[PDB]
Structure formats: C-alpha cells, structure tokens
Design a protein around this ligand. Sequence first.
Ligand SMILES: CC(C)(COP(=O)(O)OP(=O)(O)OC[C@H]1O[C@@H](n2cnc3c(N)ncnc32)[C@H](O)[C@@H]1OP(=O)(O)O)[C@@H](O)C(=O)NCCC(=O)NCCS
Ligand SMILES: *C(=O)CC(=O)CC(=O)CCCCCCCCCCCCCCC
Lengths: 352, 352
Amino acid sequence: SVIAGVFGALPPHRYSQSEITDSFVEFPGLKEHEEIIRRLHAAAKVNGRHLVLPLQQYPSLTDFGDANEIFIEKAVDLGVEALLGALDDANLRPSDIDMIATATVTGVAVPSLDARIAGRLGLRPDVRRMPLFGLGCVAGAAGVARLRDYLRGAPDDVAVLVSVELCSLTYPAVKPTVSSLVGTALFGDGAAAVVAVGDRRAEQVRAGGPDILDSRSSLYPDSLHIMGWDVGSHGLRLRLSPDLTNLIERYLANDVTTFLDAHRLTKDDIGAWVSHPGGPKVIDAVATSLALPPEALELTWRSLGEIGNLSSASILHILRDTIEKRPPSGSAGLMLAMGPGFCTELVLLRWR
Amino acid sequence: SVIAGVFGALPPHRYSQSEITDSFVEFPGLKEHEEIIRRLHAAAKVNGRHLVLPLQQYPSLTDFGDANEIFIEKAVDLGVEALLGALDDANLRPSDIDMIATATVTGVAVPSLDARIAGRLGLRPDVRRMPLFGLGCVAGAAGVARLRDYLRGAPDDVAVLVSVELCSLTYPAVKPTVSSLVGTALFGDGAAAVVAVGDRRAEQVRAGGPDILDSRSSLYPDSLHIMGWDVGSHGLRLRLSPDLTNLIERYLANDVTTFLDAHRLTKDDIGAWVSHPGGPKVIDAVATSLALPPEALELTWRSLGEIGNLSSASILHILRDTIEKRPPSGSAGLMLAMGPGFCTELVLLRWR
Ligand SMILES: CC(C)(COP(=O)(O)OP(=O)(O)OC[C@H]1O[C@@H](n2cnc3c(N)ncnc32)[C@H](O)[C@@H]1OP(=O)(O)O)[C@@H](O)C(=O)NCCC(=O)NCCS
Ligand SMILES: *C(=O)CC(=O)CC(=O)CCCCCCCCCCCCCCC
C-alpha cells in the first residue's frame, strides 16, 4: 500500500498561546487558579492554537449536549475539508474511495462521522465505513496501519483516513484540576486526512507518497489508568496519569527494537522520525528512550509549537511536514504514536 | 475467510416481557403513559429480555455517569464471556488472535472495549485493534465484513469480532416520548462474538464455516435523521423515525439484486437468510420487499421473541442459530442488517 495524499485542515480562528491564556484565566470559575493556569500554559511549548469557536464563546459552552452538537457540525465540515485536500493532493475523486475510516475521541456521533462525510462529498453508496472511536492519540498512526491492512486485502482499491479532533469542545468537562488544566495548555483543534492506494492501484495510476511497509501495535498490560476519558453528564473529562513518561522511558525502546528487528533495521536506519507530540515531557521521553539525535524530532516540536496537540490529527500534520521536506528517496521513515490502552503504534514507511 | 466459531452471551437477569411491562408502567413518571406503553410492549413480539441489572434497579439509574461506568464494567465481562465461548467453538486460544474488532453503540469507553477485552484474556500485545463505534444495528453484519476484509489480506491469520450491546443502560436518557417508548418495547442486553480465520489457516484448524465470500454496504442519501442517538448530559437518547420501514420497502430489493447480480446469483439461490430483527414491522418489510416465504425469516422472529433486539449482537445470535440448523451444504447464505446512516449491509456466505 502507498500513500497518495496527505492534508491538514485547521479552523480559521488562530490565537497565540498568550491570547488564549489571557482570556482563559478570566472565564467563570477560573480566576482563582490564574497562577497555575499561566504556569501550565507557559510550560507547554505551545505557541499558538486554532480553535473551532471564537475565544469568547467558551464560557457559554457548559452543556455537553450543546458542545457535542457543535462538534458534529464542525467536525463534518473540517473532515470534509481535509479529505478534499488530500484527494486533490492524490489526484483522485470522492467516487474513487472504496473505504473510509474516521478517527476521533473528542465527540460522539451516531451516525458516525464517516457516514456524514460520505454524504457531504457524495462518496459511493457502497463505500466501506470504519468509524474508529477510542484509540485517542494513537489513531493517526493506527489509522494508517488499518488502511494498510485493508489495502493489503484489496490491492486495487483506494482507502482514506480522516482524523478530526476538536479538543476545545470538551470544555463542558473542564475542571480546575491539574489534569484538566494540563489539557487546556496543550490541546488544539484540527483535522487531517490520508489517501492511500493498494499496490496494484499504485501500478495503475501515480501515487507519490511513501510506501506503508508494515506496522506494529504494543498494548501494555495493566495500564488502563494511564490515559483515557472519565465520561459523564458533563461530557468527556481528561484522565492523565503522571506515570506516562516513566512507562515510555521504561518500555518504548523495546517496542522499537522488536519491530525494527523484524525488518533487519536499526534505529540508525530510519531517516525520518514522525512522532506524536504528546507534550514536552513526552517528546523528551521519546528522544531519551530511543537515544535520538537532537534534530530527529524537530518537526514534532515545530508542530506542537505551531498548532498544539491535535490528538490523533497531529501525527498526520507532522507526516505532511515530513513528506514536504522530501526525505532521501528510498530511505525509511517511522511513525510513532501512543494513546489510551495504554498502547504504542509504530508504522514503517519507505520514502519516495 | 472462514468462520470457525460463533457464540452468544446474555446477562443472567431474565424477565418475561409481561413482567418488564408491569414494572415499567409503575416507574417514576410513567403511570400516565401506561396505555401506550402496554400497546407498544405487546406489539413488539418480544416475549422476554435479559437485563444487565435487576429490573427494579432501573428507576435509580438516572445519571449518565453512573450508567456508563456500569456499562464499562458489564460490557467487558460479557464481551469476554462471548469471545471465550467463540474461541472454544473454534478450538482456538486468546494468543492465536491477530486482530480484534469490537462493536457497540450503547456506551462510551476510552480506553476502548477491545483494549479491555484484550487485557482480560491476555491477547498478544501486538494484536490489531478495531474499535467500531456508531455503526449501531448494522455492526454485526458489517463487523463480519470487516473480518473478511482483513483476512483477505492475511490468509494465515485469526480475526475476531465482539459485539456488546447493553441497551438497558441508556435508561438515563429515556423519557416518555413515543420514540423512546418504542425503544423500551424492543431492546434488550447481550453480546456475541465471531471467530474467523484466513483461507490458508482454515484447513489447519478445521474451521466449521460458513465461508465469508463478499459483502456490500448501501448508505442511503440524505437519511442521517432516520436512526441514531441524540447525545447530551443525559446520555444516549434514541432517535428513530417512523419513516424507516418505508425506506426498506422502497429500496431493499435493489440493494439485494445489485449485490447478488455481481455474483450471478438470484434470491432463489439463497439457502438461508440471516436477517436483523429490528422490530415486527421491519421484519415484515424485509419479507414483503424480497418476496420471501414465511419460513425464510423464522429464526429472526424466534430470536426477537426470545431475547428482544440486541442491536448489533442479534444478527450474530441468529447466525449461530442458523449454523446449528445446518442449511443445505454448499448453498448460499445472506446476512442482512440495517442501521444508523441510514444504511444496509449484506454479507454473502457459503454454508458447510
Ligand atoms: C414498536 C412497534 C412494534 C409498534 O408497532 P404498532 O403498535 O403497530 O405501532 P405502529 O408501527 O403501527 O405505529 C403506530 C403509531 O406510532 C407511531 N410510531 C411508530 N414508531 C415511531 C417512532 N420510532 N417514533 C415516533 N413515532 C412512531 C407511528 O407513526 C404511528 O403513528 P400514527 O398514530 O400517526 O399512525 C413498531 O413501531 C415497529 O416495529 N417499528 C420498527 C422498529 C424499528 O424501527 N427498528 C429499527 C430497525 S434497525
Ligand atoms: C491522547 O491520547 C491524549 C489523551 O489523553 C486521550 C485523548 O486522545 C484526548 C485528548 C484531548 C483531551 C483534551 C482536553 C482539552 C481541554 C481543552 C481546552 C481548550 C482551550 C479552551 C480555551 C478557552
């Protein structure tokens, strides 16, 4: 399977981190926490984020029903924009799509986002739908791996992934706690789409993105508590364990070695790293654990700085940035993501 | 792709429909609606349902947070039971599984149900996970089609589907409006699992069949409103249009003919129909639209009678029942489900 198109879409409202923080600390129930909010927002290594709503509107977003309804409307808009961009990048059309997978963790849609996107773009009525909910931050990488699994079975086909994460719309569940506030420092809104074709399809029409060579999941035993949602009448409330980085530091190198061993590669054989930007401590943990050079994760840092953490969409933005730097033809790339499970997902790529 | 195991699991609290109705009309806020409640409950052609909680506990189930917490607890138990059962049917082990897909529409779990089930049964850390959320009642059929799509590219592999639907736990969102009350007439709790293997693995494990040959989705344009959830602070509230039956009557025959034509098959070639038991009017519409004999859908009527509508799990219970009845060897089978989209899914089978 071969990537043919990758495209990111962001809401038009762009704010500097300082702007967000300045407004945020004045929101109802937050003033008493100004100092810790400013401290966390400042330490995030995030310089700006796109938000799906204007800043002033968030204090009114206290009802999960309102927020989730807005999610549905805005996510379908952004998902459609990202898919169209990726299709244009691939020189393909909506009617070419044989399977669409959507990933989100920031809203609850039934019918799923893929059914709504299919309708908006006029995908064929027989398109195969794969609504992936609950993978969280791993879904960008895992989503690309699922496209490969599909296309390995259907090598004449075209399959697409659409990731849409509107983290700001979980506002009704935000509380003045360390975990929620860390969330408000890091997460932004955005979307991304990948268009991929099977090996035979790639021999019929031109696909210019990297080859998806292989993937490997790693679900860690007894780690349900590491990250996830607390779900309730206020919506989706972030649960984040302080043990996350220790887990990375202790186990990630083995995940990578195990996977790369199977391809008789070493970490020194990979020419472009495409890692999820969980946040500064996480990225630090990844670099340390894998003993990476200082610039290995430069595009990950740059993305976190520019647009924040978009959950599953971030790694796709970073993939696009990586493709655009045009890595050495024939060299290996490695996507690395992590998420609720706890789990990691690795995807081996070959550039050109 | 060959099925090797199919297994159903039900919670232990079983009540007759009459017992459920008698209690329900006395729940807080309902006595005024006794007449319509008794009418809808009798018209459902459901004679009993299994419930995950004691019947008289439901009046206290008013908070979505409590209900979803109970969902996660109970859903993992039932999913594990179902999967273990299907593995036993297949004579396979948890460590044999290469990919697990889960399907639910009745609760919100991050980490997902597949991560939880994987942990409980000690699946391999590299098992591929596919948490399908939002397909609703089509997911039994679509899930089986997703297994085929995976195994088509992985002929030595084992892939499993676990459906868990605890419809009763959506009670916090129930009010005495017609749409909700219709739901209270029909839906029960349960789970099911399917174990399937690649064509190359099939001989090695002596898979009992049937073969999974092909599938086709049919998403109906401008139909998002037909069935789905309205999500908010009270959880998952049923949206269900009275127009659903009309859509089936107008378009199902074409869905089926379009699919069968591609295989040079006719309806008369089908040795056994495995159809989702949406409700009596739906089942009639299927029989009428396809000009099927009364016996064609008998096991679907029976399942509806015995356990109610289990959303995505019902078709799998019916599939198990059908296999046990042993349709003519080598004859064609057709799974038929429908759900939020609005959509239908057909799966072509060959019986052993
Ligand atoms: C619940 C059911 C068994 C009751 O059967 P019944 O007492 O004959 O009731 P009817 O279907 O004839 O409908 C009677 C009235 O209730 C209304 N009604 C039925 N379903 C309704 C719904 N989901 N929402 C709002 N109103 C509904 C009908 O429109 C009708 O209105 P009317 O008085 O103007 O004529 C039947 O409605 C049914 O089986 N519906 C299909 C269930 C379904 O959609 N399953 C989903 C498959 S995926
Ligand atoms: C990735 O795995 C991260 C997780 O822990 C699970 C997951 O995917 C959820 C990720 C997003 C959590 C977001 C909480 C967001 C609060 C956002 C506030 C935004 C700004 C409002 C400004 C007025």
